[PDB]
Amino acid sequence: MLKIIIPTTMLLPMTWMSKHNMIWINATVHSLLISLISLSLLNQLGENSLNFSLTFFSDSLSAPLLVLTTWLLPLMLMASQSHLSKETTTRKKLYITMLILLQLFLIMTFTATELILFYILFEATLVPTLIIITRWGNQTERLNAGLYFLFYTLAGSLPLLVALVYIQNTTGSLNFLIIHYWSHPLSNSWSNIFMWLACIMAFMVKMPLYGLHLWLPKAHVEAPIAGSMVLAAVLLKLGGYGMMRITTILNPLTNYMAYPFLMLSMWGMIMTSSICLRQTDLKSLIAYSSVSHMALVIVAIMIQTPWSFMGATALMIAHGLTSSMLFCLANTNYERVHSRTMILARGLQTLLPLMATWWLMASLTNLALPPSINLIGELFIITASFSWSNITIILMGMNMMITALYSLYMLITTQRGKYTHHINNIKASFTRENALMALHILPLLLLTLNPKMILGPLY
Amino acid sequence: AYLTHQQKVLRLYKRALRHLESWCVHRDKYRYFACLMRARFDEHKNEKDMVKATQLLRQAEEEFWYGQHPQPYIFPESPGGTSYERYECYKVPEWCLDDWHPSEKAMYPDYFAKREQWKRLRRESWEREVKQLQEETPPGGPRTEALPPARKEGDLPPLWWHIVTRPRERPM
């Protein structure tokens, strides 16, 4: 994996050593180049992970996720030079440094072979995200959000720490390979249940799971645009990635100790999507939508079913691409009107003709319209859950009904309708905004042709 | 501010006939029943006592509510009509034209130059029109939403740009 980590690390001096106004260009072009090298790993061998060394390994689970992060890196960079341009050279240089330190930790996390090495970088993503949210966040409540974000995931991660070290002293090794081959049946002793709770709660908090989900509406609403997407597009998936990886030793205790989470998730999706049916703030609307889609993956993972797992990873990446995109949609309109309220800016299709389209198939992809991989993800989970229980469809099917009503609702209120009379500062959309939207839509629909590169190891 | 008794009963008259359109349909039936409505409205002119008039219209509104047509004939270019706000997704406001591009701007030089003429006139008329507004403003804030007209010569009436330069009802 050093063909990716090393250029990413060497890009850190690259930005700092750059000139005054060339930082955006060099960082963008090389990050895009880093993305291209990441695509070299999409080929996964028959039934073996592409084990490179003891330090780093990759399989069909992290292969799509890794290139999603590298592909993301230009997109935050392409979404940041609007509000950041009115700042000193150092602070802009610092901002780029953080995201690159962010992706570097993310790249190391997905490729880590050892659960402890997984663990260290998995919490380490807090440090750059926390400062990004707090420093450049354009709001007042962000100060409370940083505390809410940091403690909430840490409050679950710290009990996780004691779980891994216990496994190391008891079972022996702790890497992703030996655990799978030396997996032993977990008993029903009450101590095993608490270890199950410790080994699981840390991952559910970052998903999030309904109830333990209040840190998204705080963080996402007033996070900076660049930090908003990564936290929405991968950092939620980071909690997801550990769910497949760590549920190799928690069998068969998963069958009995999952009912509270399934009930919390299968009911939370209806409740959280019911949140989305009415939101005064567009960004809050998108953040809660991420809760519902992620709650689908929690159901997907907890069943622990072949079909369920492939649907989980397919939805996991697909949601990240569209959720990041919709956040870019919010940033554009919020930039023109300098506010976040729904009804303030309306009838924007007439004023901006192309953005009417960009927000349109963004909503369709959010709607899991077939064959968009959002559908191939959600539909797989329904089939797996229905096999698990025939009444799952009543709830999870009703989600697609509720998901439709709010998804178009933001399309109806903002894009369609009559133009706002007093608003007159909306200029023609710059080609940067239009291009950035295409950098999200095109890979999504392009990847629809070959879902086998997103269906994960269980494919 | 206050729809007086005469204003309300005329409003009752206008709405009553419009509903009776949907009922009578055919014109010959219309001209008869409208005349009864007219004749039976003329009879209570010497009612004198205003209290009776409220009682005379008390049963009238509910009687209209009794015989109101569930599908009244509402006019297409009106609220509730089929062609209501339909021809609106094309009337982009005037101020959007300022954000045009010079290549686009050079396409229509004469109109753009004349628009600049209207642009300057609004700039010159603003100070006079805002000054005129406050010089005869009523005490304790504006009491009536009606705005003063242009009193002297040359000066344009205050708050005119959006009314005058409103998009046409048939922009296409």
């Binding site: 901006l352 710059f430 | 109109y111």
Partner: peptide, 12 residues
């Protein structure tokens, strides 16, 4: 008779 039509700039 032809007359001017207002349209948001699509050149960008």
């Amino acid at each position: 008779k032809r007359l001017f039509i207002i349209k948001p700039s699509g050149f960008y």
